[PDB]
């Protein structure tokens, strides 16, 4: 599955879309670790 | 690359006769 046409400018656009998606993992994974750590300590309580 | 090398090959052809 491809999205748009290659122009030498779309490559910088697609790298910007990839950059937000790469930081959309770690910024949201650590949220899912902050929720699970309280979820595991509530279960012990 | 193929277009620019073809121009240079044709540019030597006209230079050789002239």
């Amino acid at each position: 599955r491809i999205e748009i046409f290659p122009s030498r400018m779309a490559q910088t656009i697609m790298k910007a879309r990839l950059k937000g998606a790469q930081t959309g993992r770690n910024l949201l994974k650590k949220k899912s670790d902050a929720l699970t750590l309280r979820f595991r300590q509530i279960l012990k309580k | 690359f193929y277009r620019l090398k073809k121009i240079q090959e044709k540019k030597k052809i006209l230079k050789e006769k002239s």
């Binding site: - | 690359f1 193929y2 090398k5």
Partner: protein, 589 residues
């Protein structure tokens, strides 16, 4: 004719006139300073020559001296311990002759010096009048204590002996053999000249069976290489690259070691050229240097790019020359990615069409025609010897991705891939050879030799690899679920996998007793780590908690098997026999 004139220079390329009897890919000497070039196009009476050096100050009318030879190497005594560049100019001799710190670019200094005298001895039943064919061992020159430089006949010519030299000291210019053929008696000295692009002829190829004992435990057990095989490693900045290269020179079963540093760096090349002359070799007697059996092709990026293209072909021709004597040559090319950049420069010079990501159309063909020059193979000649060439070629892909027109062309040709990892070097897991992505296509060949010599080994490797793959699959669920919900048969696999990763796979190269463990120790420690794993299966299916606390001295015996010093050789097998039965006691309890 014997000279040509220049008739125009337009860059690296010289379109030399008055060259009517010149061949293609022939080397010439352009100008008054005699710049080395290569004939690359031949338009009637004129030939265009790409010059390997900087054309600067070349006149129109300068003599182009043709040699009549293609790019070739000088093969003879004076080659072990020497340091050449890709077109074989002796860098150690060129600094003593000129007393300068540069390469003067007009220097036709011979690769083998004609002043040192070598003790030649004949073949002793090679009588006068005897017929001799190409590849026959003609004499023996004692080059060092280790290397007996066997003088041979070139594979081109053939004849009957008319004069042989008496045993004594001669130069590389002295006439040693005369051979009569139908027309004219030919004479030649101890040195032969052979082109680098042309594969050395040989009697018949053989399948490779004997493994290479590198000395490292992850290399010799899980992903083994054979002598006569092809290996590739990642060439990153620091994982284990200089460590595996120096362990291959120090503790392998190989008679000579050549190292081709091919367009490497400014200061990474000087790290090799200072550390290799100060390495040490363990021969049966007293400790010798590694440089008695070593020849280096040192080639930096400042050097000519047509010398960095030829550095791979120079090395493998020196590899095939010491193959023909009967030795077991091992070749380390570092790196083959910097060589492929030299192909992109030569093809970009001649405006060749870019096939795959810049690299030319013949990139996969030159790589195939280089790794196929390696193999265990019966040499030409009547004395009937056997030799081999192993190739370990480093690959430096961009960003550590293994999808590249050089990398994917390499992994489709090589059979062994020791995957050295950067992150394993971050945790100081030494050596850093990853085991998920590594492979070895040399198991079946090895499978023959291991039933004549080790026997109880193969099944040991198969289950040890079955532990490490099941460990990674189990370790994913440890963070998701937890260790308290894991089954009893699975948790004993995890502790012995951690026992393998610390005792078997981890190996300290500075801890004296671990520099060169030979083989049984390698079959020794794995025969006790998996028999403990097999006995723990029925002992669990008969409690995991009571065995972990009560075997803490017995597990300490397994975790200390790597300290069997080299003053303990036969005694180490007796300790391997007795430490096993201590496991046999505590199974019933």
């Amino acid at each position: 004719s014997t000279f040509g004139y220049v008739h125009g220079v337009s860059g690296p390329v010289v379109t030399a006139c008055d060259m009517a009897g010149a061949a293609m890919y022939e080397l010439v000497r352009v100008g008054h300073s005699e710049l080395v070039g290569e004939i690359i196009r031949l338009e009637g009476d004129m030939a265009t020559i790409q010059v390997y050096e900087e054309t600067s100050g070349v006149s129109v009318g300068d003599p182009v001296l043709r040699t009549g030879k293609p790019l070739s190497v000088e093969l003879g005594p004076g080659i072990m311990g020497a340091i050449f560049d890709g077109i074989q100019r002796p860098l150690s001799d060129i600094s003593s002759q000129t007393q300068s710190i540069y390469i003067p670019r007009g220097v036709n200094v011979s690769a083998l010096s004609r002043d040192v005298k070598w003790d030649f001895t004949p073949c002793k039943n090679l009588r006068v009048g005897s017929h001799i064919t190409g590849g026959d061992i003609y004499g023996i020159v004692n080059e060092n204590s280790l290397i007996k430089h066997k003088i041979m006949l070139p594979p081109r010519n053939r004849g009957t002996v008319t004069y042989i030299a008496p045993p004594g000291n001669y130069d590389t210019s002295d006439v040693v053999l005369e051979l009569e053929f139908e027309g004219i008696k030919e004479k030649f000295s101890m040195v032969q000249v052979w082109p680098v692009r042309q594969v050395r002829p040989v009697t018949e190829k053989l399948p490779a069976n004997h493994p290479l004992l590198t000395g490292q435990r992850v290399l010799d057990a899980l992903f083994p290489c054979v002598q006569g095989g092809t290996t590739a490693i990642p060439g990153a900045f620091g994982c284990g690259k200089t460590v595996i290269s120096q362990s291959l020179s120090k503790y392998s079963n190989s008679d000579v070691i050549i190292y081709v540093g091919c367009g490497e760096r400014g200061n990474e090349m000087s790290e090799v050229l200072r550390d290799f002359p100060e390495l040490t070799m363990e021969v049966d007697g007293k400790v010798e240097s590694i440089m008695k059996r070593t020849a280096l092709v040192a080639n930096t990026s400042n050097m000519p790019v047509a010398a960095r293209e030829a550095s791979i072909y120079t090395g493998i021709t020196l590899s095939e020359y010491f193959r023909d004597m009967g030795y077991h040559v091992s070749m380390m090319a570092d790196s083959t990615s910097r060589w492929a950049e030299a192909l992109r420069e030569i093809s970009g010079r001649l405006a060749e069409m870019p096939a795959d990501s810049g690299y030319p159309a013949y990139l996969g063909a030159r790589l195939a025609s280089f790794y196929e020059r390696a193999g265990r193979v019966k040499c030409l000649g009547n004395p009937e010897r056997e030799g081999s060439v192993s190739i370990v070629g480093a690959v430096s892909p961009p960003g550590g991705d293994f999808s590249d027109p050089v990398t994917s062309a390499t992994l489709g040709i090589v059979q062994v891939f020791w995957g050295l990892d950067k992150k394993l070097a971050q945790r100081k897991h030494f050596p850093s050879v990853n085991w998920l992505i590594s492979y070895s296509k040399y198991m079946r060949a090895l499978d023959e030799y291991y039933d004549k010599h080790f026997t109880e080994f193969v099944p040991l490797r198969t289950k040890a690899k079955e532990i490490l793959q099941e460990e990674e699959d189990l370790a994913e669920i440890v963070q998701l679920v937890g260790k308290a919900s894991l089954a009893e048969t699975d948790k004993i696999t995890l502790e012995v996998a951690k026992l393998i990763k610390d005792d078997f796979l981890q190996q300290n190269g500075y801890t004296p007793y671990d520099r060169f463990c030979p083989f049984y120790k390698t079959v020794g420690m794995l025969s006790n780590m998996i028999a403990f794993y097999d006995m723990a299966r029925r002992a669990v299916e008969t409690t995991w908690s009571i065995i972990r606390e009560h075997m803490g001295e017995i597990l300490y015996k397994l975790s200390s098997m790597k300290f069997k010093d080299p003053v303990k050789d036969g005694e180490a097998k007796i300790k391997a026999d007795y430490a096993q039965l201590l496991e046999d006691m505590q199974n019933a309890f």
